[PDB]
Amino acid sequence: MSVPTDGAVTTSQIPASEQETLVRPKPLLLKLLKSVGAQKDTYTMKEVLFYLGQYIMTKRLYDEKQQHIVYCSNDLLGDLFGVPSFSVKEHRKIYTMIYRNLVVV
Ligand SMILES: COc1cc(NC(=O)C[C@@]2(C)C[C@H](c3cccc(Cl)c3)[C@@H](c3ccc(Cl)c(F)c3)N([C@H](CS(=O)(=O)C(C)(C)C)C3CC3)C2=O)ccc1C(=O)O
Numbered sequence: 085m086s087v088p089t090d091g092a093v094t095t096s097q098i099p100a101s102e103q104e105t106l107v108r109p110k111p112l113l114l115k116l117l118k119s120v121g122a123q124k125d126t127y128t129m130k131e132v133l134f135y136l137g138q139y140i141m142t143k144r145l146y147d148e149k150q151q152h153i154v155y156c157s158n159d160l161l162g163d164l165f166g167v168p169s170f171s172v173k174e175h176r177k178i179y180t181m182i183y184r185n186l187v188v189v
């Protein structure tokens with residue numbers, strides 16, 4: 085990972101320009117972002133990933149760091165993504181699940 089600002093996280097697995105994609109989260113995704121301090125309705129993807137990461141850690145969905153698995157089956161995030169769990173290493177898979185929950189500007 086890289087952290088180009090205090091509210092963004094990027095990855096070499098995804099093109100840099102893709103992480104600058106402007107998006108308008110649908111209501112559930114937006115709710116999760118605002119629960120950890122987000123104050124707007126439009127974001128770059130790298131900001132969405134930052135806030136989703138904060139949400140995951142705040143809800144204690146990634147306690148076992150070395151296992152690299154988020155367990156979200158009983159959380160809003162599991163409903164958002166439509167999976168019971170996923171790997172924090174699989175960044176394209178994560179981007180794909182997020183894209184289903186937003187409109188691209
Ligand atoms: C790809 O290979 C690896 C990946 C990893 N780990 C990751 O890629 C996970 C990552 C470091 C980036 C990992 C990340 C970062 C940028 C983009 C993407 Cl798609 C993923 C990122 C993350 C953020 C949001 C979501 Cl929804 C998610 F599932 C995972 N998170 C966040 C923490 S954070 O990076 O935001 C930090 C607080 C440390 C700045 C954790 C809470 C979910 C990570 O911890 C570890 C080891 C290896 C290896 O084999 O060497």
